[PDB]
Amino acid sequence: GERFPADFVWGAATAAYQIEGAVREDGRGVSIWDTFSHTPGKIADGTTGDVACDSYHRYGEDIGLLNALGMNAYRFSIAWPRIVPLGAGPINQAGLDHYSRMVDALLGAGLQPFVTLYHWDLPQPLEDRLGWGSRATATVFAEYADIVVRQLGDRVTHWATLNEPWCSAMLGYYLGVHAPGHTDLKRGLEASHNLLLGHGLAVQAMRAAAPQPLQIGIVLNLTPTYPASDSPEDVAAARRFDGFVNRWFLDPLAGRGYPQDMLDYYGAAAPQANPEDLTQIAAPLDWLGVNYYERMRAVDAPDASLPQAQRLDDPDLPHTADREVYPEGLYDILLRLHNDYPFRPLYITQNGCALHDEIAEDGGIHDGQRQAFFEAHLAQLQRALAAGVPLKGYFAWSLLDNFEWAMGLSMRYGICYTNFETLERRIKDSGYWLRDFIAGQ
Ligand SMILES: OC[C@H]1O[C@@H](O[C@@H]2[C@@H](O)[C@H](O)[C@@H](CO)O[C@H]2O)[C@H](O)[C@@H](O)[C@@H]1O
Ligand SMILES: OC[C@H]1O[C@@H](O[C@@H]2[C@@H](O)[C@H](O)[C@@H](CO)O[C@H]2O)[C@H](O)[C@@H](O)[C@@H]1O
Ligand code: NA
């Protein structure tokens, strides 16, 4: 009841800005996250992605970790700023050559590359022209996608267009906690539409530019939502939050248009989604990736910002450094995708947790709660497979401790510990647990 398919993808995941550093090297342009990180007060601990894990130079060390963990895949992102530094403008061949070498190093190690094209590092020049608030950014995103697949698509079969458009749109343009840091609902919703349109345009451009058949998907963060009580007010709140995070993206991707309950709720703040756009958004996916960290147990919050839902913590569930642990939410969300939506196959493209990790006296990192996190979530994946869910792989978040966006370097999600001063990496106990679990397969 333990065993995964022999062809199951086992990996760990990262994002370029979170790990690479070398922010001005080899022609790289300025990204929104460079601008944002360098804006006083935006990052909790004053850190930036300027060095991060120095993976631009140290990716071979990262490959060494993945090999030591007995993984058979690595999910990582390509930095648009390294490929088209102005966003819309000339290619930077040095950037493409870098990722060509990295892809070859992965394939040489027996690690399948699962490449994300957009993991939040929009070139700043595009943001100067409204960024995801402009349709033209979707156009030039698709051009970037074409450029990269033409060069690497002879070797990489598995691509994702976007990582987590809800974060880019709602955290970056509505709540202002992620780059570029805008705070307007209409801007967030407009951004969400142009992200989805970028996705659709990119799929078509990638299929046209591809030198071989590709497996193209999109990666969504999904948060299963539960009403804290069965009162109408709390059930409605759960429904609005579920629409805000999940259905807003799943439905148009599924060819169902935007969810009408949310359209009516947002009113004129929602974009004018003409039919032609929705057709483009609903391009068939070869796979869908799910990023899962937590559930939302919702109570009505009439006085809060839309969607007027607040989290009610449950005393019966333990917390990590930053979240409630709820492994069964992964089962629920997969069963929902399996039964309620058409996408298949599915991958878990990010799942992991943050702890107050410390190097112990013996030199290891004794992260038992993270081991238990993986054990429990993988148990729920076994249950989901048993129910018929077409799950084809699992990527642990993250390969190593990294720059976690607005939290900076101070929130450690790695299965490997990163010393940010020396840049040494050390496998945590949870990493060795994953190694041995995967090898039992
Ligand atoms: O049939 C299974 C595949 O269904 C695709 O979803 C399509 C969607 O692309 C299309 O817009 C609407 C039109 O009604 O139909 C759905 O079935 C998924 O994208 C694939 O992942 C899935 O394999
Ligand atoms: O920096 C830590 C990780 O934060 C996650 O963001 C979660 C998101 O998954 C979830 O859907 C919403 C609402 O429940 O909460 C956010 O905090 C990102 O998905 C990860 O990429 C990121 O590594
Ligand atoms: Na705790």
Side-chain angles (χ1 to χ4, degrees), residues 132-173:
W132 292 109
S134 175
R135 284 179 69 86
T137 297
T139 296
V140 299
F141 171 70
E143 292 172 359
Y144 155 67
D146 168 320
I147 288 155
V148 179
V149 160
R150 280 190 196 275
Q151 297 226 12
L152 302 183
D154 57 337
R155 285 159 293 161
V156 178
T157 50
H158 283 60
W159 301 79
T161 54
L162 312 176
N163 181 80
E164 305 178 53
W166 181 90
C167 286
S168 295
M170 297 309 190
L171 301 182
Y173 291 83

Side-chain angles (χ1 to χ4, degrees), residues 152-222:
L152 302 183
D154 57 337
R155 285 159 293 161
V156 178
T157 50
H158 283 60
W159 301 79
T161 54
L162 312 176
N163 181 80
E164 305 178 53
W166 181 90
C167 286
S168 295
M170 297 309 190
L171 301 182
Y173 291 83
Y174 171 42
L175 297 181
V177 298
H178 283 181
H182 291 315
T183 53
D184 181 69
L185 171 70
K186 176 168 213 183
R187 291 177 180 241
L189 286 177
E190 178 184 49
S192 80
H193 185 73
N194 289 328
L195 283 153
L196 285 170
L197 179 65
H199 162 77
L201 294 174
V203 175
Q204 224 286 65
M206 296 161 73
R207 286 177 173 155
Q212 76 176 312
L214 302 184
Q215 302 305 305
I216 306 173
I218 192 177
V219 170
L220 301 182
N221 55 303
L222 297 176

Side-chain angles (χ1 to χ4, degrees), residues 96-118:
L96 285 166
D97 290 348
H98 167 83
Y99 290 111
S100 181
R101 288 185 291 273
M102 179 177 166
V103 159
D104 285 346
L106 287 162
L107 290 174
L111 297 165
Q112 181 180 3
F114 266 67
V115 177
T116 308
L117 284 169
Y118 184 73

Side-chain angles (χ1 to χ4, degrees), residues 116-138:
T116 308
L117 284 169
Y118 184 73
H119 203 136
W120 306 353
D121 39 359
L122 181 72
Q124 181 65 48
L126 297 181
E127 184 58 34
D128 296 341
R129 298 150 181 70
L130 301 180
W132 292 109
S134 175
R135 284 179 69 86
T137 297

